[PDB]
Design a binder for this molecule. Structure first.
Ligand SMILES: Nc1ncnc2c1ncn2[C@@H]1O[C@H](COP(=O)(O)OP(=O)(O)O)[C@@H](O)[C@H]1O
Ligand SMILES: Nc1ncnc2c1ncn2[C@@H]1O[C@H](COP(=O)(O)OP(=O)(O)O)[C@@H](O)[C@H]1O
Ligand SMILES: Nc1ncnc2c1ncn2[C@@H]1O[C@H](COP(=O)(O)OP(=O)(O)O)[C@@H](O)[C@H]1O
Lengths: 447, 71, 439, 201, 245, 426, 55, 41
């Protein structure tokens, strides 16, 4: 008789690049005219094609490319297209040029955090663990007396064992306030203890208690498992520099204090490199060297640019992508010196430059269409042509930005779609950079 | 009564699209296919930093200068 | 007589945008008057904020000093209401010595995305009849006990657990106390004493006003809505037992790996229906204070799917971008100005000026004659609007000091002689040009 | 300031220029303890050897001596405090807490040396009461909430052995303090005095 | 830094004793408008909001709410409901602890603190002493808060109304100190659209009072249904073909 | 194959500094070519480093960009190798937020002078054949090599060590007899049944092994600085290290040097891009180069007569005459066509790619039109278009394709002059 | 048995009241930005002691 | 410096240039310990 269903969970939010799904190549490496949500830019998309081959080759260290071209030309969108084309597995580290100016560590070292974060590593961590209901807890003592050894009895649905354990595990059980009848998990590699709560066998022993009870664990008490960890080299560099691991008073204390950054010594990266080369030679690991993308690179300091010379040459370093949108600009921190793209010529020799074209009106229409069917809105043909008309006079971003304001006006007067009168009305409310600069230059006596 | 796949099920359902009871199991509950593992951070130790016996005997200012440090 | 912490300030008369349901501005409503073009536009972006589907959309409100840019910003803050986060930043506030600019903006963004959680829990709310606590003669410490609770309708006995016993005895709980216990949290709370059992008593154990005995069933539900920003979710996750950092603000430059992980787990709580996400507004007032370093952060921050709707305001013409040589519109780089819609405000007529002064006098409890309004309207066109808004209270106080009930034209001419307009002080600065320092 | 941003030094001074004036009772019992006398009930409860209904503490002050009656939980705390007859002690009547000040000055001769500073006998009655009209700036509330001073946890002791630092107090703490001073101003508990901030130069 | 800590712990004891003496008498000047006294430079107790006065006054203790070891969000309104009649009421501006599940970030990696091996019999006792914690005084001082608080904690099982611990033992973070995670049982619902649909049907039917049978194909599915039905405490029974006659 | 952390980078092809015994460079060997003047000069500097006897000395490698000034400085590091400290920094790496700019150079100067010592240790190594224990305590151990066996009476501090570390019969173990520490190497192959497996040691069980060890002079400062020093060595908490501690440690090492219990091993500081230093930092190099513990330092620069940082003054190399007077300047030179083609062959060996001889000719033309470095970057991208084409070898039309995909700086700058108003600022 | 005179400068009373163990900073130098609430309390107290004749 | 003011680094170095010259007898005892006997009472 009846049919029933439900769904009310909100979507992910729509965003200024969420229509980008890939580079839209064919198998020859040519760009399709419009595919994967992109249009145009073939002379750049083919080049980005060679760079996604370059990442997936793993062979190179410190190769770098610069996406250059006017505002609104899609340089960030193409860098996102590279990120989508690599999929989830390979790390892509986004960065903005003004992020180097930390107040906690030198600019020159904030770049090394990102360089070490853009190299990914995969590990088969063969952990082993004890878990169960604690049926017994009995410490053992030694000469001047103090604790020396521990008995813990554990029980699970598949058996029970009377374990013999290190007195640091007793100190750790005491810290977690573990008692008989508690269900606990112990990571034997790490001394770590997690108290889940009392076993459900005791679930009504009081009318009130603060606990939430848990079911008795399944399988044997003592067992090992092949956990697969995805981690960056930076996550090895930092965890050794201010360790929260282990069970002692010093690590337990150092976890609570303010987590200031610190200027990591090269010798520690030397140890991490020696360690991970052993994990690769044992066949435990896989390395996944990925991408560092520095958007707005043109306001790195000449300190940073002169450090990038040494970084991009390092046989460790990840592949790099830069973006810039500047002409013959003065390089920040130099005051005297003007160069292409806001980048010193000394660095500009070290990058393969990808040149980004401006759009024709007939490409504006096609981006705007693809954008409207991403915003989730319907538009009539003369209305879409009027956004293209505006796009010839103004800029690509402005013609996109008029869409949803017009869609609100459309449904505020009950229509299903944007009509030209809704775009034409919206253009009277929301000025652009060009038209505002006119009225602001006319009225300049009053501002 | 109809049901969507959950956001986690859709991944495993596509892997099956790329043997009908092996297909029903994931659609019914993904714990029938793979149980959610007890995750924990990766645990690591370096080498212990080796200090020479000579440096430990003659090489700390706390020790070799103690007679001066008293003043 | 009574006076709450919030009082009559520079926008307290504004209570919304005064739009009809067709999204047209009424000539005077909800404290807004005149200014049709910008109020219309503010209505559209307010509707876009309530829709919330789209991320990182932005607006810059522009026009003369003293023409309601901030009025319209507060108008939409009140029209949006308390349940959806609106963060006001004056552009100078990001120049911390504790943290860098890109951190201070990332905090201002993430403070402006709300995660809303219903906490529903079962409480026992009762009057203590009696308690027994049992303690071993020495032993391992296996404490045990019983507690009894009443209402005006019902009463019962509870056999107590080990952690309950320490939480009860920690707060000195006793017969005649009224208490509210959360069964899931395991936490007590104390409402006061009932009037009854406090007579069988000693030299004083406490001194507080009594509370009436609880009514209905002894066990009852509670519901709370939390509104937790992404910023405080990141701070709580930055260090264990970090909860005081939400107040002290002392956590600088939070690890990127926290934000990366919270962006995922906040999406999972939406897909579980466990928490709502409610994207709000960031109002960067006076944005021409941001450096070109900070605008270049906004270029690439304002394209995250977690970005709030961002509103600038500014009053500057062609002026150089702070921290650089380059002249540009509004003191903003075209790198950013290309990305956001500009809403243009307009100067005021006699009608608008008189109508603004009249709605201001209503909120300040002032009576003035139409002649006093005529001269104050003249003053509000011969001089900037804020100076006229500054004579109103002074004229009401001079009127009160001479025990008048209504402000007359000569009360305003008195106050105009007494407190100077900038244009008159900067004129007197010419006779004393040898006596003021550093001209 | 070197500690904190320019605008926050202004925002703190904007919060110094607003005062609460908040009035409350202090009530306390104090005096030299003349005796500690637990009082039994001749019938015990079933299965137990003896039972106490209350403890009497005799207290003395320059105005007189009084036997206070107290619930028997006090005797546990009066052996956490190392109390002996002829100590001077006090008990907070609003709270039930008890504290030891030292041996009473009348006994400052029973040894030629002893390792405590002797306390002069309290004056006024054994039970004291007053009202006080306390005053705090909202900035004092901002700092007392931002950096608590009670020491019964390692975060507070560490935070109090470390150097004190001015910190960029959030608009949330300002918000919560505003929300709660309204809760008391509405109830007439707290007066409010909007003050003046004066900046020279 | 050990003597710093003990001299601090005693100074808090001295603060409550000083505050009583400082606030309940006015015997003019000590020899007729002459001579100061021991402790007279300690003025940190004269502030109305200082801890001794703030604890002695019943009311200021509520304006200084953000205590160092609680998860206070700030104030909110609350709603409370009766189970019978569905009648409800509002509580205006009360403190709230944050929900028990916002603490969900973790280090990806947790390294052991670095250790200096050395090739000498006297040297290896020193690193051993450091691995233990270098005196029982300093160890008890961090772990339980002070050596008197440790000596007391060892017997607090024998006391009716104990004080809080002062140490690292004063702290209890929402997950415990370990980052290791066992999946929350609610995940059974949110992993299956069928099990989520079932929970809304069982809450529908339990609110209506109807008796219900559930049929499934797989014994491994009946395990999943049972772990859900146990977790929500619905009452349950199962008769798979592996059940005895 | 698998990839370790080190992969093919901008200097990976350089495996030394190819020289005859005469300190004359042959045309191409050890992975680098040409630069006959600069490489003969670098040979003489490499001998001054290896001799060690002269202290506080400097060479500045200067010349046009792309001329191998980092190449010879990186080859010199490979030729010097382990067992002598070499440390590299970029000039903008000393500008710490957390440490004085002048102290950061003082650390760089003293990472790069080594102390070397030798110590003798009684080490026991063998397969554990059997282990026994009782309830004070007593117990018995047996160890085996391929050439002997023993039994042993254990003492209490060993008993607690063997039992703590779960040492089991059939392990192969090393016992640090001075310290009670146990290292386990694996299990014997004959007990691999019921992982890592290994053969027993050779020779006798108890060897009085000699260990040579080296600590940088700075690494002694950090050990001395804190209740545990060595944490601050790795974690970077070393900052503003008290100069009276250095005044003692330098004088202490100066007596170990002559009582003969230690020897000091002068290393190298390579302070790359030296023109980034302020005149404040040059003022430190002016004087820190005149003390016995100073290493030799190599500095590299590519600047003409230029404004020295922190002033309006212009001087050669971007260095004040103040400091240039301390040092010897070796000039690199711009490459000829022959050397240019030969570098491209060696990069093609190091990247492992074949290309046509006329492909090497057109790529050499591109190299001479674009100052080499851009042509080196085309090699890899050409091979990737060849792989897209399923080609065996890079052809001229693979290079002409990739030359149109990726612009050099000159064509990029020329195209930036067409749309000159569309980019921001000029 | 005697009374004695101490001279102590107002800054030391300001530092001693700045934190729980403030007198260590009189020697260590490691103090700065003393809260203005302390300095104006010390004015009131030192003026009060002068009116009470005690200092 | 980045931890202390410029005038402090002058003052520290002005104080490094003034020396005390203290005389004491070094007195070393060393050897195998043959007995220990502890001997308020
Ligand atoms: N080729 C393209 N294909 C698809 N979307 C594009 C393309 N070029 C630009 N866009 C879109 O237009 C806007 C401007 O591009 P963007 O990458 O932001 O420019 P810019 O490099 O100057 O910062 C973004 O919404 C972007 O996703
Ligand atoms: N349209 C308006 N309706 C009502 N009050 C207004 C309006 N425009 C401005 N005001 C009031 O006049 C004053 C000037 O407005 P303000 O927001 O401060 O100007 P702006 O931000 O543009 O410089 C304020 O007191 C404000 O409340
Ligand atoms: N002599 C050489 N033999 C082999 N490769 C060289 C040689 N000289 C330069 N190279 C290569 O050309 C690049 C340019 O020289 P480099 O030393 O890096 O110049 P610079 O330091 O001025 O930027 C080197 O990084 C290396 O890849």
């Amino acid at each position: 008789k009846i049919e029933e269903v439900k769904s009310t969970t909100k979507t992910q939010r729509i965003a200024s690049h969420s229509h980008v799904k890939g580079l839209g190549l064919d198998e020859s490496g040519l760009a399709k005219q419009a595919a994967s949500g992109l249009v145009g830019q073939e002379n750049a998309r083919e080049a980005c094609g060679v760079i996604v081959e370059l990442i997936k080759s793993k062979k190179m260290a410190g190769r770098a490319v610069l996406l250059a071209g006017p505002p609104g030309t899609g340089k960030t969108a193409l860098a996102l297209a590279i990120a989508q084309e690599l999929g989830s597995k390979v790390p892509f580290c986004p960065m903005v040029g003004s992020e180097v100016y930390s107040t906690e560590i030198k600019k020159t070292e904030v770049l090394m955090e990102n360089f070490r974060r853009a190299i990914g590593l995969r590990i088969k961590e063969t952990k082993e663990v004890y878990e169960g209901e604690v049926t017994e807890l009995t410490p053992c003592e030694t000469e001047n007396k103090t604790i020396s050894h521990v008995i813990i009895g554990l029980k699970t649905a598949k058996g029970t064992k009377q374990l013999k354990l290190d007195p640091s595990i007793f100190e750790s059980l005491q810290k977690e306030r573990v008692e008989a009848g508690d269900v606990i998990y112990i990571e034997a590699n790490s001394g770590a203890v997690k108290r889940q709560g009392r076993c459900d066998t005791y679930a009504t022993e009081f009318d009130l208690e603060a606990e939430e009870y848990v079911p008795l664990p399944k399988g044997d008490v003592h067992k090992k498992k092949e956990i697969i960890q995805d981690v960056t080299l930076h996550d090895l560099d930092v965890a050794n520099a201010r360790p929260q691991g282990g069970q002692d008073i010093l690590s337990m204390m150092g976890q609570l204090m303010k987590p200031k950054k610190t200027e990591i010594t090269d010798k520690l990266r030397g140890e991490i490199n020696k360690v991970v080369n052993k994990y690769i030679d044992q066949g435990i690991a896989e390395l996944v060297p990925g991408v560092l993308f520095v958007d707005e690179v043109h306001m790195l300091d000449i300190e940073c640019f002169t450090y990038l010379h040494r970084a991009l040459e390092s046989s460790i370093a990840p592949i790099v992508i830069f973006a810039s949108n500047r002409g013959n600009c003065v390089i920040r921190g130099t005051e005297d010196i003007t160069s292409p793209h806001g980048i010193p010529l000394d660095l500009l020799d070290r990058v393969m430059i990808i040149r980004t074209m401006l759009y024709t009106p007939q490409e504006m229409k096609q981006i705007i269409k693809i954008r409207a069917q991403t915003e989730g809105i319907n538009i009539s043909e003369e209305a879409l042509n009027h956004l293209g008309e505006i796009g010839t006079k103004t800029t690509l971003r402005y013609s996109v930005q008029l869409l949803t304001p017009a869609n609100l006006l459309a449904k505020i007067n009950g229509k299903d779609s944007i009509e030209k009168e809704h775009v034409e009305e919206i253009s009277e409310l929301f000025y652009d950079a060009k038209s505002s600069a006119k009225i602001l230059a006319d009225q300049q006596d009053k501002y | 009564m109809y049901c969507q796949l959950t956001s986690r099920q859709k991944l495993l359902y596509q892997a099956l699209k790329n043997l009908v009871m092996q297909f029903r199991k994931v659609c019914n509950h993904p714990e029938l296919f793979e149980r959610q593992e007890t995750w924990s951070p990766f645990h690591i130790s370096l080498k212990p930093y080796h200090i020479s016996k000579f440096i430990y005997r003659h090489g700390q200012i706390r020790v070799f200068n103690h007679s001066r440090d008293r003043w | 007589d009574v006076t709450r912490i919030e009082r009559i300030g520079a926008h307290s008369h504004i209570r919304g945008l005064g739009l009809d349901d067709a999204l047209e501005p009424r000539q005077a409503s909800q404290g807004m008057v005149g200014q049709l073009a910008a109020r219309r536009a503010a209505g559209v972006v307010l509707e876009m904020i309530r829709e919330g589907k789209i991320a990182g959309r932005a607006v810059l409100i522009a026009g003369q000093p003293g023409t309601g840019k901030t009025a319209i910003a507060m108008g939409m803050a009140q029209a949006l209401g308390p349940d959806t986060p609106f963060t006001a930043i004056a552009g100078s506030e990001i120049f911390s010595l504790e943290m860098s600019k890109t951190e201070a903006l990332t905090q201002a963004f993430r403070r402006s995305i709300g995660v809303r959680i219903k906490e529903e829990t079962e409480i026992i709310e009762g009057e203590v009849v009696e308690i027994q606590i049992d303690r071993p003669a020495t032993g391992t410490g296996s404490k045990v006990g019983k507690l009894t609770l009443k209402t005006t309708e019902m009463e019962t006995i509870y056999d107590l657990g080990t952690k309950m016993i320490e939480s009860l005895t920690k707060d000195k709980v006793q017969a005649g106390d009224v208490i509210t216990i959360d069964k899931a949290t395991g936490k007590i709370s104390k409402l006061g004493r009932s009037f009854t059992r406090a007579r069988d008593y000693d030299a004083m154990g406490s001194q507080t006003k009594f509370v009436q005995c609880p009514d209905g069933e002894l066990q009852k539900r509670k519901e709370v809505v939390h509104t937790v920003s992404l910023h405080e979710i990141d701070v709580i996750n930055s260090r264990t037992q970090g909860f005081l950092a939400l107040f002290s603000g002392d956590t600088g430059e939070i690890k990127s790996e926290v934000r990366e992980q919270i962006n995922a787990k906040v999406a999972e709580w939406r897909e579980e229906g466990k928490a709502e996400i409610i994207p709000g507004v960031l109002f960067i007032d006076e944005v021409h204070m941001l450096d070109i370093e900070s605008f270049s952060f906004l270029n690439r921050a304002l394209e995250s799917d977690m970005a709030p709707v961002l509103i600038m305001a500014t009053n500057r013409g062609i002026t150089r971008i702070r921290g650089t040589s380059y002249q540009s519109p509004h003191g903003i780089p075209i790198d950013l100005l290309d990305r956001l819609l500009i809403v243009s405000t307009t100067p005021y007529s006699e009608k608008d000026t008189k109508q603004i002064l009249r709605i201001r006098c209503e909120e300040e409890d002032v009576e003035m004659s139409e002649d006093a309004y005529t001269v104050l309207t003249r003053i509000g066109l011969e001089t900037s609007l804020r100076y006229a808004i500054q004579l109103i209270t002074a004229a009401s106080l001079v009127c009160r000091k001479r025990k008048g009930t209504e402000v007359q034209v000569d009360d305003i001419k008195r106050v105009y002689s007494l407190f100077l307009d900038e244009s008159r002080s900067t004129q007197y600065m010419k006779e004393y040009q040898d006596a003021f320092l550093f001209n | 300031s070197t500690e904190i941003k320019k605008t926050e030094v202004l925002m703190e001074n904007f919060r110094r220029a607003i005062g609460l004036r908040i009035k409350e009772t202090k009530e306390v019992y104090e005096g030299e303890v003349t005796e500690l006398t637990p009082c039994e009930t001749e019938n015990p409860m079933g299965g137990y050897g003896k039972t106490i209904s209350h403890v009497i503490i005799g207290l003395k002050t320059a105005k007189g001596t009084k036997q206070l009656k107290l619930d028997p939980s006090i005797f546990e705390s009066l052996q956490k405090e190392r109390v002996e007859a002829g100590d001077v002690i006090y008990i907070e009547a609003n709270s039930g807490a008890v504290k030891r000040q030292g041996r009473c000055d009348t006994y400052a001769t029973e040894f030629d040396l002893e390792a405590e500073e002797y306390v002069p006998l309290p004056k006024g009655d054994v039970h004291k009461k007053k009202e006080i009209i306390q005053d705090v700036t909202l900035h004092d509330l901002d700092v007392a909430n931002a950096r608590p001073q009670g020491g019964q946890d390692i975060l507070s002791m560490m935070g109090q052995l470390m150097k004190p630092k001015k910190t960029e107090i959030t608009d949330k703490l300002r918000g919560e303090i505003n929300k709660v001073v309204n809760k008391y101003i509405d109830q007439g508990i707290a007066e409010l005095v909007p003050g003046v901030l004066f900046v020279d130069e | 830094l050990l003597a710093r800590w003990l001299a601090l712990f005693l100074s808090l004891k001295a603060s409550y004793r000083l505050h009583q003496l400082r606030s309940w008498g006015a015997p003019e000047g000590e020899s007729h408008q002459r001579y100061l006294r021991n402790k007279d430079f300690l003025l940190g107790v004269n502030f109305p909001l200082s801890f001794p006065n703030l604890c002695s006054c019943p009311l200021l203790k509520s304006l200084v709410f953000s205590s160092h070891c609680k998860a206070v969000s700030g104030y909110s309104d609350q709603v409370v409901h009766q189970r019978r009649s569905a009648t409800s009421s509002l509580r205006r501006c009360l403190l709230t602890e944050l929900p028990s599940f916002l603490c969900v970030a973790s280090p990806r990696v947790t390294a052991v603190p670095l250790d200096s091996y050395c090739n000498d019999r006297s040297a290896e006792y020193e690193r051993r002493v450091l691995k233990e914690g270098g005196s029982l005084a300093a160890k008890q001082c961090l772990l339980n808060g002070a050596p008197e608080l440790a000596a007391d904690w060892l017997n607090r099982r024998s006391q009716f109304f104990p004080e809080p611990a002062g140490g690292l033992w004063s702290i209890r973070p929402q997950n415990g100190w370990s980052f290791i995670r066992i999946p929350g049982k609610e995940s059974l619902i949110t992993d299956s659209g069928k099990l989520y649909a079932l929970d809304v049907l069982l809450t529908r039917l339990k609110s209506q009072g109807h008796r219900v049978l559930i049929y499934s194909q797989m014994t491994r599915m009946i395990d999943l249904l049972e772990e859900y039905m146990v977790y929500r405490k619905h009452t349950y029974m199962r008769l798979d073909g592996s059940s005895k006659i």
